[PDB]
UniProtKB/Swiss-Prot annotation, chain B:
The keyword RNA-binding applies. This is Small ribosomal subunit protein uS15. GO terms for biological process: translation. NCBIfam families: S15_bact. Part of the 30S ribosomal subunit. Forms a bridge to the 50S subunit in the 70S ribosome, contacting the 23S rRNA. Coiled coil: none annotated. PANTHER family: RIBOSOMAL PROTEIN S15, BACTERIAL AND ORGANELLAR, SMALL RIBOSOMAL SUBUNIT PROTEIN US15M. One of its GO terms (molecular function) is structural constituent of ribosome.
RNA sequence: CUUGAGUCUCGUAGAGGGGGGUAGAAUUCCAGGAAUACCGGUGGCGAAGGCGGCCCCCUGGACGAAGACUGACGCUCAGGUGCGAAAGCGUGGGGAGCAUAGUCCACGCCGUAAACGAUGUCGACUUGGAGGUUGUGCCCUUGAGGCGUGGCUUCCGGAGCUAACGCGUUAAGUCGACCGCCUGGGGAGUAC
């Protein structure tokens, strides 16, 4: 949830959250980890803003 | 609630060690954990979801008291002495 | 069982009369030894062995002569809450008397001939055919 | 008691008042994108031990402060 | 001695007079079911020697009062 | 007496709620009302109506791995009492997204509906096959992985059953204990 590497490699370049239906993988923990991702400032708000 | 203060109240009532689910030890653990939970329903006063979970064990508190009543009239009175019930 | 040990046994046996398994097994009270020590002797099934002493439990051997299976139509009648204590000169003969009629007499459970030989009826346990 | 964790965000032009604020809020330890800013700072985090009430005095001192904007508390068991 | 009809005590708020119910089975006459049925009949006794909740042996007697024609013989149960 | 049930230990997963403030991937007026884009789904929670931003606070249920002891202590329900989609109405305000109050919070009435698994509840038994998801034992774990082995939920199907259509190990199949309800259509959810 807190890692800049292991979360931003598994976000999409449109800024949004990767679905597991395309990634294929812990996801139910990873989703809520990226649900709270917006305040950490190791990421942008999204890729377009 | 569940671990800490229950561990100091368990051996207060057991006829020996690890007789935990005996009916004396049962209700006195349980009735204690209706007073303290009623501190939580001393306020919040809109949690109608969880209030039945309180209403669950209040009726079972009277259920096992029947099991003291029908078997041993002595031990029945002894714990409601120690708890001040009804 | 929860709320009749002998009714819920009689579902367990004739389900073996619908897939033709060899051995059947149910948790066995001391009444339940006295059940299948009648069904064996009248010939409806073959052999049984009680086992277990903290779970006393049976090993009944079924009996299907063909694709046809021998125990055709067994029915419990006196179900709890509908006791039918038969006086003996009413007695249910099962299928014009061609079967047997398991009656809980005083002198035991083994009952074809309580009509004349023993001479006292009681609660029906189950018809057997 | 219960273990906890402290998460907050630090003002860049008053990043020089980090350890002075630390020893102020270490009293409870001993007691028991445009966000209108540069998006460049340094973080200070630690895993704390304090129970349910010793913590409650800490957060209610941040509506009177101007450097930190968001107060976030989590756990790891 | 009649059958020595066993019963209970329901209430005593009366002056030397009690209320007895009697457990009683029966075949229900058309369905064939056993309904535990109970009656309620006043019973004379002087000493107040049975309490509310006992088990009582009862025979008949001369009709003493209105609504009460049964004397106590003895008690087989404390409260 | 130990298997029905039940308490403890111990972990596990989660739109179960209540309060508290928070606050943008977004959005009209000159300020702020709203509430998720993404994950979002055949997922997942709960007794149902239901409930989705984020973190902590008091609380709710279930689950698994073992031990331990209680010795039938249970299952069911007429009345009974709670929780009760919308609106309406009451009293106390607001006014954008946009229906001119009302919708929105809130304190009181109101209990209404496709409140339709159009499938009371618990228990035990019977051919099955493929996927869901949560675990966790053994096994070079040598791994994404096998055999089990828990729990619930899908999808097609044997026997049996059903007027068919169909159901089909989460039953409607073989049963047992208990509760609700129906006995031709209209007049009618109406007269008093």
């Amino acid at each position: 949830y807190k890692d800049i590497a292991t979360l931003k490699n598994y976000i999409t370049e449109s800024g949004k959250i990767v679905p597991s239906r395309i990634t294929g993988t812990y996801q139910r923990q990873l989703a809520r980890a990226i649900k709270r991702a917006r305040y950490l400032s190791l990421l942008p708000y999204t890729d377009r803003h | 609630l569940s671990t800490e203060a229950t561990a100091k109240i368990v051996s207060e009532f057991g006829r020996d060690a690890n007789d935990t689910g005996s009916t004396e030890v049962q209700v006195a653990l349980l009735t204690a954990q209706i007073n303290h939970l009623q501190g939580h329903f001393a306020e919040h006063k809109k949690d109608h979801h969880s209030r039945r979970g309180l209403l669950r064990m209040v009726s079972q508190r009277r259920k096992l008291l029947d099991y003291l009543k029908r078997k041993d009239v002595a031990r029945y009175t002894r714990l409601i002495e120690r708890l001040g019930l009804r | 069982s929860m709320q009749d040990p002998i009714a819920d046994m009689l579902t367990r046996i004739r389900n073996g009369q619908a897939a033709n398994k060899a051995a059947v097994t149910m948790p066995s009270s001391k009444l339940k030894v006295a059940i299948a020590n009648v069904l064996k002797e009248e010939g409806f099934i073959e052999d049984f062995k009680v086992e277990g002493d903290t779970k006393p439990e049976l090993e009944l051997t079924l009996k299907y002569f063909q694709g046809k299976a021998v125990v055709e139509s067994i029915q419990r009648v006196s179900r709890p809450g509908l006791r039918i204590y038969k006086r003996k000169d009413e007695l249910p003969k099962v299928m014009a008397g061609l079967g047997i009629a398991v009656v809980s007499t005083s002198k035991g459970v083994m009952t074809d001939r309580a009509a004349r030989q023993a001479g006292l009826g009681g609660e029906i346990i189950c018809y057997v055919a | 008691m219960r273990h906890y964790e402290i998460v907050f965000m630090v003002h860049p032009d008053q990043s020089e008042q980090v350890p002075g604020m630390i020893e102020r809020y270490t009293a409870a330890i001993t007691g028991a994108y445009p966000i209108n800013k540069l998006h460049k700072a340094h973080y200070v985090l630690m895993n704390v031990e304090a129970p349910q009430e010793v913590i409650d005095e800490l957060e209610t001192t941040f509506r009177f402060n101007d450097a930190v904007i968001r107060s976030m508390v989590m756990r790891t068991k | 001695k009649i059958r020595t009809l066993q019963g209970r005590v329901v209430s005593d708020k009366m002056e030397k007079s009690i209320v007895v119910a009697i457990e009683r089975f029966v075949k229900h006459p058309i369905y064939g079911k056993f309904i535990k049925r109970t009656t309620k009949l006043h019973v004379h006794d002087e000493n107040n020697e049975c309490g509310i909740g006992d088990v009582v042996e009862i025979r008949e007697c001369r009709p003493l009062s209105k609504t009460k024609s049964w004397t106590l013989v003895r008690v087989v149960e404390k409260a």
